[PDB]
């Protein structure tokens, strides 16, 4: 089960100074349209498509939506399954500067998906602790150029992926506090340990917040399965030698198939046991409404277009 959402951030001053207009428009609660600006001495501008194309998503958001409304529409409903032992995954996707970290982390004055989700998680846990015992841990790591760091304890350095079944980052810090100011301060400071751009957080830094939840019954004279749900909340990287071993392909392409031992990325390996049959995935794509962003916005809307 997959859900795709699209969020349009408000236009920025820097886009207005460059001279941009509005070309992205939420038309509808699940449809956005992308107007084509114009330019060039070229362009047979008549066309036939010719200047406006619509895209449909499970849900859409522009500047009218608040942080909590984005949360309610995207990840709130994952929570019941996670404490019940099901797995779930939320991606913030899109080009740099379009909203990912704002949607996922937010700000002190306007928090995002992380703390809102951690918060309904601890309520749901207490409204059912009549019958159940729970254990909750969370970690917050970076993947930067396939190197993993613990964002809550950078001193430890480069960590590896060891199987402890489930694939876990061997050695990573694990928090259990239930207060949302504390979590938010943790996640704010941990965000600043993300690898920076040599010229600011690198456009190539995945931030993964994972929350594990174990659930066992308080009734001890009947066995019952012990449950382990795993929520992943991801702030992705931005959307934006002779290797002629390519007849390698022009020769596998004769009766099919496969000739490469592909390596799974760290993020794929971490998400392997999750993201499967009875597991949910929520992607939140982000765009600018600015005309100066028309090409990235169209790549994004194409990629997420349901
Ligand atoms: N929907 C939104 N509403 C208001 N401000 C936003 C919104 N999306 C992003 N911003 C702000 O604009 C800037 C966008 O940066 P950011 O969210 O870091 O983009 P990304 O994480 O995709 O690089 C940030 O300063 C953020 O606070
Ligand atoms: Mg970011």
Numbering used by the authors: 11 to 175, 178 to 211, 215 to 255, 277 to 342
What sentences appear in the manuscript?
We investigated the molecular mechanism of the dual functions of the KIF19A 353WT monomeric motor by solving its crystal structure at 2.7 Å resolution. At the initial stage of the 353WT structure determination process, the residues of the switch II helix α4 could not be determined because there was no corresponding density at the site where α4 is usually located at the center of the MT-binding interface. Instead, we found an unmodeled helical-like density, which was more distant from the KIF19A catalytic core. When the Cys283 residue was assigned to this anomalous signal, all the residues in α4 and the following loop L12 were reasonably determined. The overall structure of the KIF19A 353WT motor domain shared a similar triangle-shape with other kinesins, which consists of a central β-sheet of eight strands, sandwiched between six α-helices, three on either side. In the 353WT atomic structure, Mg2+-ADP was found embedded in the nucleotide-binding pocket. In comparison with previously solved motor domains of various KIFs, the remarkable features of the KIF19A motor domain are concentrated on its MT-binding side and include the long and wide L2 loop, the flexible L8 loop, the disordered α4 helix, and the short α6 helix. Loop L2 is located at the minus-end side (rear side) of the MT-binding surface and is atypically long. Loop L8, which is the major MT-binding region at the plus-end side, is more retracted toward the catalytic core compared with that of kinesin-13. The switch II helix α4, which is considered the main contributor to MT-based kinesin motility, is more distant from the motor domain than those of other kinesins including kinesin-8 KIF18A.
